[PDB]
């Protein structure tokens, strides 16, 4: 184990994550579920229409408005961030690899 | 079986060199378990058991099995009940009809109610790419088709491409398994979905005699 | 019973101690 | 991480509805008499 | 443990069983339920009357026609041996539980001892 | 010709309409693209009219030239 | 340990792709038998082993095969050429 612990392997994972400042969210009952969210960044403010699992995840997280939220398209993890000191810096959906 | 030879010589003469040369010459189809003498002194089981385990590892077995799998994208799912209410018990659910789509066409399958139960367990909806093994009746949910990738502009779904080839492809699978692998499989089976099974799964895999 | 009334006699003895087809199957 | 205790109002709470929201900047309003007439007609 | 491994015990078990392919099941329920059942072999056929506990076991096993089942008259336990070959065509994919076996021969009720 | 009474009701209806599809309407999947440039990697709906955009440049173009609510 | 969950998922995803494809179900071939003692009975097992229906499959397969041989004799020289006759296509489809 000591010998193997000193041999490192770097693996690159490219994840699609949206990082944005937040704008009001409509969740509705079955008419399975209808919902819309809006995200603001430094140069865009646009509406996304959610699906079943995204609605479930946002209900579980109980995300508020006017704060900052990071959502990964592939993994689906949602990371909360404090209120806008900070602000989105560009495009709503970025393509950045994590090593 | 049981033939033994000893590579005898002084330090830095080529004993390990000859051993690794033998391993290379034998090829990747012949088992070759390297070892050192100190590794036999275990703290979980007697050194005799560890010698027996390693000794069996070097008896490879090549077993071949032909498997038939149904894979594709679900287009229809129309459960049917028995023709007569008196035919069965309770729900009285009869066969289910599933429509799969592949790169080479579509096929309509007639499935057992057990396969329908597997479908319900895997939470499969229309458009999901699935995978059914007629060998065991096991249903796997590969994911959603890339055709429906842009159905919703924000959704957490593992979109997967449409399966290539025919919907029903039969393949002959060949694998090399050691005798020790079978011994481990019998000793510590991975089957079972009970709470007791999960608690045992969380336990460390300590070697046993 | 709560309005100091006796219960049914058969029900009394049953509580002290404690037609049509529903399923037919045949191979075609 | 996750809030194990939540306070709710029986009037506002339901699982059905989840909702949250925040040269003079003001929302545009449409003086389209045709569109308003359509709205009242339909 | 080594010493006891070198001694073997040859024990005899006597088993009484009824095995056969169920032909027809008819269950009537209000009160307690009553029903009649017919089991056939390759050279025998018999109609039996079922008690409440036997019917409960049949329901909890979810037995259908054409199935070969075994019942221990001591305990009444019901085991589904398998399905007939004639029902094989009915599906494209088969579950793990399904089994195709022939109809047992001889007398419906048999006594057997195993060492 | 189409308004002419010599072209009968059944003839007209058969010739124009019957050749049109009546039961199948979409059997390929549905593909949404950027309203400016046809992209699909990312999509969202503009707050002003709900047409679909993919990038900041496309958002500026939709706001200046395109958007139909103004 | 929460910070390592993403890495764990990544490694498991990387290994599953190779693990699932080229493995032989040892349980399917009865190589694993320590669970069989829980849900099976000795005399039940020996009776089920005695009542196997291989003869039924073989007999029906031979009746199909002789019917197919008769049909192939009737058809003659079978070919996969583009069909220009309903009868020929129907016979080829029945053969396949
Ligand atoms: Mg050396
Ligand atoms: Zn664009
Ligand atoms: Zn617009």
């Amino acid at each position: 184990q000591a010998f193997r612990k000193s041999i490192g392997i770097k693996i690159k994972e490219e994840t699609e994550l949206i990082e944005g400042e937040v704008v009001e969210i409509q969740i509705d009952r079955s008419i399975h579920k209808q919902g819309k969210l809006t995200i603001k960044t430094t140069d865009m403010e646009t509406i996304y229409e959610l699906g079943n699992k995204m609605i479930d995840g946002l209900t579980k997280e109980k995300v508020l408005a006017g704060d900052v939220i990071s959502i990964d398209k592939a993994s689906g993890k949602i990371t909360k961030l404090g209120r806008s000191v900070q602000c989105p810096e560009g495009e709503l959906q970025k393509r950045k690899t994590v090593v | 079986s049981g033939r033994a030879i000893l590579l005898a010589g002084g330090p830095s003469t080529g004993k390990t060199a000859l051993a690794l040369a033998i391993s290379q010459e034998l090829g990747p189809k012949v088992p070759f378990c390297p070892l050192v003498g100190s590794e036999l002194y275990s703290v979980e089981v007697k050194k005799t058991e560890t010698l027996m385990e390693n000794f069996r590892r070097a008896i490879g077995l090549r077993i071949k099995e032909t498997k038939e799998v149904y894979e594709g994208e679900v287009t229809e799912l129309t459960p049917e009940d028995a023709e007569n209410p008196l035919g069965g018990y309770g729900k009285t659910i009869s066969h289910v009809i599933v429509g799969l789509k592949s790169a080479k066409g579509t096929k309509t399958l007639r499935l057992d109610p057990t396969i329908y139960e597997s479908i319900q367990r895997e939470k499969v909806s229309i458009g999901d790419v699935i995978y059914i093994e007629a060998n065991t009746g096991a249903v796997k949910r590969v994911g959603r088709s890339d055709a429906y990738a842009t159905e919703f502009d924000l959704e957490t779904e593992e979109y997967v491409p449409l399966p290539k080839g025919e919907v029903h492809k039969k393949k002959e699978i060949v694998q090399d398994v050691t005798l020790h692998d079978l011994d481990v499989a019998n000793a510590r089976p991975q089957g079972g979905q009970d709470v007791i099974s999960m608690m045992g799964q969380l336990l460390k895999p300590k070697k046993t005699e | 019973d709560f309005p100091n009334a006796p219960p049914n006699l058969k029900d009394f003895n049953t509580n002290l101690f404690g037609m049509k087809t529903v399923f037919h199957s045949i191979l075609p | 991480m996750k809030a194990l205790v939540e306070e709710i109002d029986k009037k506002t709470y339901n699982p059905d509805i989840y909702f949250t929201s925040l040269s003079r900047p003001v929302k545009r309003i449409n003086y389209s008499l045709a569109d308003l007439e359509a709205r009242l007609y339909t | 443990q080594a010493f006891r491994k070198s001694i073997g015990i040859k024990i005899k078990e006597e088993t009484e069983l009824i095995e056969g392919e169920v032909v027809e099941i008819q269950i009537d329920r209000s009160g307690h339920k009553q029903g009649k059942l017919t089991i056939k072999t390759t050279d025998m056929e018999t109609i039996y009357e079922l008690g409440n506990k036997m019917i409960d076991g049949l329901t909890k096993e979810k037995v259908l026609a054409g199935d070969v089942i075994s019942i221990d008259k001591a305990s009444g336990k019901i085991t589904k041996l398998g399905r007939s070959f004639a029902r094989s065509r009915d599906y494209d994919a088969m579950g793990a539980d399904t089994r195709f076996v022939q109809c047992p021969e001889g007398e419906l009720q048999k006594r057997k001892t195993v060492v | 010709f189409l308004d002419s009474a010599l072209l009968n009701l059944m003839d007209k209806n058969v010739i124009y309409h019957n050749v049109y599809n009546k039961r199948y309407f979409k059997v390929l999947p549905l593909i949404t693209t950027c309203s400016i440039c046809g992209g699909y990697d990312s999509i969202s709906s503009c707050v002003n009219c709900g047409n679909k955009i993919c990038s900041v440049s496309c958002f500026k173009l939709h706001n200046e030239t395109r958007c139909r609510n103004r | 340990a929460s910070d390592y969950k993403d890495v764990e998922r990544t490694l498991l995803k990387l290994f599953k792709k190779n693990n699932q494809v080229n493995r032989v179900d040892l349980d399917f071939l009865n190589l694993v038998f320590t669970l069989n003692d829980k849900d099976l009975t000795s005399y039940h097992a020996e009776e089920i082993s005695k009542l196997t229906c291989v003869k039924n499959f073989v007999e029906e397969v031979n009746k199909l095969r002789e019917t197919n041989k008769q049909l192939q004799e009737e058809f003659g020289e079978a070919s996969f050429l583009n069909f220009q006759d309903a009868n020929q296509y129907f016979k080829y489809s029945n053969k396949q």
Side-chain angles (χ1 to χ4, degrees), chain A, chain B, chain C residues 1-19 21-28, chain D, chain E residues 1-32 34-115, chain F, chain G:
Chain A
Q1 279 170 21
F3 268 66
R4 305 265 265 166
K5 272 197 194 73
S6 44
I7 298 300
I9 295 155
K10 299 185 69 47
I11 318 168
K12 48 177 186 294
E13 286 295 322
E14 204 268 335
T15 61
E16 283 306 276
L17 72 164
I18 47 172
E19 171 50 80
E21 170 183 17
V22 183
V23 182
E24 67 187 38
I25 308 186
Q26 178 175 17
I27 305 297
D28 213 341
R29 199 52 201 276
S30 182
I31 186 158
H32 192 260
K33 286 180 183 176
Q34 299 288 122
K36 313 193 200 302
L37 69 79
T38 305
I39 299 296
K40 177 174 290 186
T41 176
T42 189
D43 46 14
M44 291 188 278
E45 178 192 328
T46 69
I47 301 180
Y48 288 81
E49 293 179 354
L50 292 62
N52 209 330
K53 273 177 289 305
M54 186 49 71
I55 282 174
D56 298 347
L58 284 169
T59 48
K60 171 83 167 194
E61 291 294 329
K62 199 194 173 172
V63 181
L64 309 179
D67 65 2
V68 178
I69 199 67
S70 169
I71 302 184
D72 198 304
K73 285 191 61 61
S75 306
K77 197 147 56 75
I78 316 178
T79 292
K80 294 194 179 75
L81 291 166
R83 182 200 178 282
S84 55
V85 183
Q86 307 187 353
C87 56
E89 302 188 308
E91 302 180 354
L92 287 166
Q93 183 177 321
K94 296 184 177 66
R95 312 172 190 170
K96 54 186 164 182
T97 317
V98 58
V99 61
Chain B
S1 163
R3 306 297 316 281
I5 73 169
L6 158 67
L7 306 193
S12 78
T13 315
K15 306 172 274 271
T16 316
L18 293 168
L20 293 167
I22 282 173
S23 88
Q24 297 284 70
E25 187 71 31
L26 281 180
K29 332 174 185 177
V30 176
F32 182 86
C33 292
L35 266 174
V36 298
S38 53
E39 286 179 353
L40 277 300
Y41 300 100
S42 171
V43 296
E44 308 184 347
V45 76
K46 54 185 185 193
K47 51 195 89 77
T48 285
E49 183 52 68
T50 69
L51 180 52
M52 190 70 216
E53 286 189 340
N54 295 329
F55 196 85
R56 270 170 76 97
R57 196 179 288 99
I59 306 295
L61 183 81
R62 177 139 61 226
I63 178 158
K64 49 194 183 293
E65 166 198 90
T66 183
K67 190 154 75 71
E68 300 197 349
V69 286
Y70 292 98
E71 72 194 34
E73 169 207 293
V74 184
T75 62
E76 290 176 353
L77 266 168
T78 312
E80 293 187 1
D81 53 343
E83 310 180 334
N84 299 288
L86 310 160
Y89 313 94
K91 309 175 177 181
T92 318
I93 184 65
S94 89
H95 75 108
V96 73
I97 281 169
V98 69
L100 275 77
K101 183 198 289 159
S102 197
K104 298 291 180 68
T106 60
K107 193 173 195 297
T108 71
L109 300 176
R110 207 178 205 266
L111 301 179
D112 271 305
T114 308
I115 313 298
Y116 179 60
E117 290 181 354
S118 282
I119 287 281
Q120 281 181 342
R121 286 187 188 94
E122 288 280 61
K123 291 181 177 66
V124 161
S125 71
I126 300 172
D128 300 9
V129 169
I130 66 162
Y131 166 87
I132 307 184
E133 299 191 314
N135 286 36
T136 76
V139 170
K140 186 173 73 175
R141 185 178 184 274
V142 175
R144 194 83 161 158
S145 185
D146 290 347
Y148 305 101
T150 184
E151 165 185 5
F152 301 120
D153 54 33
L154 183 62
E155 181 58 12
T156 301
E157 276 269 21
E158 183 68 29
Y159 300 110
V160 289
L162 194 69
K164 335 289 188 190
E166 296 292 330
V167 57
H168 173 61
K169 36 181 70 75
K170 176 257 296 176
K171 55 177 188 289
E172 306 187 315
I173 292 180
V174 172
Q175 194 192 354
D176 169 41
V177 294
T178 63
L179 296 183
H180 178 64
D181 273 13
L182 313 181
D183 295 329
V184 171
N186 293 337
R188 307 190 321 274
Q190 310 179 350
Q193 299 205 21
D194 202 358
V195 170
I196 300 300
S197 315
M198 214 185 73
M199 290 305 116
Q201 284 298 296
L202 305 161
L203 269 169
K204 63 187 171 190
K206 201 183 164 250
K207 275 188 291 301
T208 56
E209 43 177 0
Chain C
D1 199 342
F2 185 63
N4 57 46
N8 200 359
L9 189 60
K10 50 175 177 285
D11 289 333
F12 178 75
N13 199 249
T14 306
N15 287 346
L16 280 176
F17 300 129
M19 186 46 67
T21 72
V22 300
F23 164 83
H24 184 280
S25 159
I26 188 167
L27 193 74
Chain D
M1 185 63 72
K2 261 72 189 183
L4 312 190
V5 184
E6 171 178 28
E7 314 188 17
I8 65 160
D9 308 333
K10 300 189 190 181
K11 188 179 299 294
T12 304
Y13 179 79
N14 48 64
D16 302 329
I17 304 176
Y18 182 91
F19 172 68
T20 180
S21 183
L22 280 299
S23 64
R24 181 171 84 86
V26 70
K27 300 289 94 176
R28 281 184 62 247
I29 190 154
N30 63 327
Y31 312 95
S32 176
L33 274 296
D35 191 23
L36 197 156
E37 180 173 8
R39 285 176 281 192
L40 64 87
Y41 192 84
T42 69
Chain E
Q1 287 184 26
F3 268 59
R4 305 189 71 86
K5 283 178 184 289
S6 302
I7 299 294
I9 319 297
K10 195 176 77 173
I11 184 166
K12 301 190 279 267
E13 185 176 2
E14 295 94 2
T15 57
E16 171 265 351
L17 296 164
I18 53 171
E19 310 182 38
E21 167 200 60
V22 294
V23 192
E24 61 180 53
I25 298 180
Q26 173 175 342
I27 299 166
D28 312 335
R29 164 70 138 82
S30 183
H32 60 270
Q34 66 97 30
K36 273 168 279 296
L37 178 138
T38 297
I39 283 178
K40 88 183 286 184
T41 76
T42 69
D43 52 351
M44 195 66 206
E45 179 261 324
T46 309
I47 303 169
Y48 291 107
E49 290 182 351
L50 319 166
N52 56 299
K53 305 177 67 70
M54 163 69 61
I55 292 160
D56 287 347
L58 285 185
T59 51
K60 78 169 47 63
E61 201 56 38
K62 271 185 37 151
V63 59
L64 316 174
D67 299 335
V68 188
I69 64 170
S70 314
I71 306 102
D72 191 6
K73 208 169 183 180
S75 71
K77 185 67 177 92
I78 292 149
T79 287
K80 197 184 303 178
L81 291 204
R83 269 153 62 173
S84 190
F85 174 92
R87 308 179 66 192
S88 76
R89 181 69 70 171
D90 282 351
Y91 298 91
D92 311 336
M94 290 290 175
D97 200 11
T98 194
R99 288 174 313 260
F100 309 116
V101 293
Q102 310 174 23
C103 187
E105 290 200 5
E107 176 81 350
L108 184 40
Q109 194 156 335
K110 290 184 185 294
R111 299 274 295 196
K112 188 186 295 295
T113 175
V114 57
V115 290
Chain F
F1 283 159
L2 263 61
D3 189 39
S4 75
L6 296 182
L7 275 297
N8 273 9
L9 278 299
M10 60 280 282
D11 284 334
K12 182 78 66 59
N13 183 55
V14 161
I15 294 158
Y16 278 76
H17 307 276
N18 284 12
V19 300
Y20 301 157
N21 298 117
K22 302 205 315 294
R23 294 306 297 172
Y24 299 166
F25 294 101
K26 190 71 182 173
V27 308
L28 294 186
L30 194 152
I31 285 173
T32 54
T33 56
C34 173
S35 190
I36 302 295
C37 71
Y40 79 97
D41 280 319
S42 192
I43 286 294
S44 60
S45 174
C46 84
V47 288
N48 299 127
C49 73
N51 298 287
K52 300 192 194 295
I53 44 169
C54 78
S55 176
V56 59
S57 81
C58 291
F59 173 88
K60 293 191 296 180
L61 263 68
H62 185 77
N63 188 43
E64 294 176 7
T65 180
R66 196 70 89 71
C67 197
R68 214 179 190 182
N69 84 357
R70 175 163 42 77
Chain G
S2 313
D3 293 334
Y4 208 81
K5 298 192 312 290
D6 296 334
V7 161
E8 173 213 7
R9 287 189 292 114
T10 287
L11 268 297
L12 290 170
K13 187 185 291 296
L14 286 163
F15 266 90
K16 193 178 180 178
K17 174 68 173 65
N18 185 283
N19 265 275
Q20 63 176 347
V21 285
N22 206 359
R23 270 191 173 285
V24 171
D25 214 335
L26 307 187
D27 205 332
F28 174 73
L29 299 178
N30 309 328
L31 290 189
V32 185
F33 47 82
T34 53
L35 273 298
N36 308 343
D37 303 319
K38 289 210 307 175
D39 63 333
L40 211 48
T41 317
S42 60
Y43 46 80
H44 281 168
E46 78 187 2
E47 206 73 52
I48 294 160
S49 173
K50 183 175 182 292
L51 278 172
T52 49
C53 66
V54 70
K55 301 300 299 189
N56 306 82
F57 281 94
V58 172
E59 180 162 22
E60 292 298 330
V61 164
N62 282 284
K63 190 175 177 68
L64 293 163
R65 199 169 60 88
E66 67 92 17
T67 307
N68 301 355
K69 194 256 189 181
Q70 186 63 82
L71 287 162
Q72 190 268 335
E73 283 203 66
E74 200 273 335
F75 187 71
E77 187 71 31
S79 187
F80 60 96
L81 204 55
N82 306 356
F83 306 94
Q84 288 307 127
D85 195 2
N87 282 311
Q88 186 181 0
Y89 172 79
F90 195 85
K91 269 169 278 177
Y92 193 76
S93 176
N94 266 6
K95 183 257 184 183
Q96 73 186 358

